[PDB]
Amino acid sequence: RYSKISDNYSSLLQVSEALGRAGLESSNLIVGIDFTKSNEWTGAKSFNRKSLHHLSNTPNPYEQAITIIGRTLAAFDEDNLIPCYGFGDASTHDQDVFSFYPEGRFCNGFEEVLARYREIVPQLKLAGPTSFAPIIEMAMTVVEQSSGQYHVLVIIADGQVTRSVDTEHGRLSPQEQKTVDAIVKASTLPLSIVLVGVGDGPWDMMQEFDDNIPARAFDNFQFVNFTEIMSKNKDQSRKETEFALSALMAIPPQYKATIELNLLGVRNGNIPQRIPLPPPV
Numbered sequence: 001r002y003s004k005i006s007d008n009y010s011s012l013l014q015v016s017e018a019l020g021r022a023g024l025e026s027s028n029l030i031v032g033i034d035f036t037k038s039n040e041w042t043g044a045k046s047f048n049r050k051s052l053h054h055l056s057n058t059p060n061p062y063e064q065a066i067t068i069i070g071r072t073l074a075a076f077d078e079d080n081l082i083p084c085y086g087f088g089d090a091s092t093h094d095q096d097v098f099s100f101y102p103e104g105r106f107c108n109g110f111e112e113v114l115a116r117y118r119e120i121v122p123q124l125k126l127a128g129p130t131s132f133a134p135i136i137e138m139a140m141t142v143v144e145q146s147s148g149q150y151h152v153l154v155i156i157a158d159g160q161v162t163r164s165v166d167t168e169h170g171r172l173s174p175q176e177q178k179t180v181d182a183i184v185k186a187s188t189l190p191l192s193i194v195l196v197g198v199g200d201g202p203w204d205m206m207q208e209f210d211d212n213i214p215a216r217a218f219d220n221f222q223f224v225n226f227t228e229i230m231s232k233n234k235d236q237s238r239k240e241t242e243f244a245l246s247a248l249m250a251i252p253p254q255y256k257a258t259i260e261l262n263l264l265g266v267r268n269g270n271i272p273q274r275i276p277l278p279p280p281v
């Protein structure tokens with residue numbers, strides 16, 4: 001499906017213009033980066049046995065994903081300010097996020113996101129386990145504080161939410177329970193959630209994850225497998241557009257939904273204010 005579309009897009013500019021014609025207007029970007037220790041070994045097949053956070057003169061999957069999503073959504077960003085958070089390191093585990101800059105200062109453009117990412121990475125202690133509840137809750141807080149302006153949260157992660165040891169008897173882990181609850185609660189806000197999977201995974205349980213999310217007023221969640229798309233044997237510029245479209249083509253209908261539901265521009269009033277920890281640097 002997305003492959004059939006992207007075959008006719010030669011640049012990210014074309015993808016951006018398409019999102020514009022599909023109804024996307026002023027749109028804000030929030031980025032959450034997975035800093036769990038698993039990043040050390042999930043690059044086995046996908047990244048030459050290097051850490052997914054390994055820095056060099058070639059961008060790692062995080063930098064690549066940021067660049068592609070950043071370039072595509074930049075035209076819709078009126079203030080060009082991108083709240084950025086890390087999670088899954090030793091300072092946050094599955095309980096918190098930390099802001100890329102002290103006092104929660106937003107990054108100025110995706111270029112600064114990239115630069116500041118490279119500054120922070122070598123000073124982190126990677127940990128775990130994996131939950132997306134703190135980063136989704138942080139996004140909720142930002143949306144509410146902005147008085148209900150539309151946001152797209154892009155989570156870039158190298159694993160699914162941590163499962164229960166007793167998952168085979170139908171039990172959810174706290175990480176799963178709180179993450180699913182956050183996804184549902186987020187649908188009461190003008191917020192779209194995109195989970196970008198990098199590394200080896202496994203990612204084969206995501207469609208079933210998606211299928212089991214409880215009923216929401218609109219479908220506010222998308223998973224996209226960066227690795228699978230960028231591993232294809234086809235043109236590089238064409239892999240980029242396919243990724244951008246796969247990650248973002250559902251955003252304009254979601255945006256339209258936040259308008260039809262009258263979520264846009266209003267404060268919900270039931271959003272706990274999550275505080276981001278300082279960057280542990």
Ligand SMILES: [Mg+2]
Nearest residue numbers: 036038158159
């Ligand atoms: Mg991980």
Ligand code: NA
Nearest residue numbers: 028079080081
């Ligand atoms: Na913005």
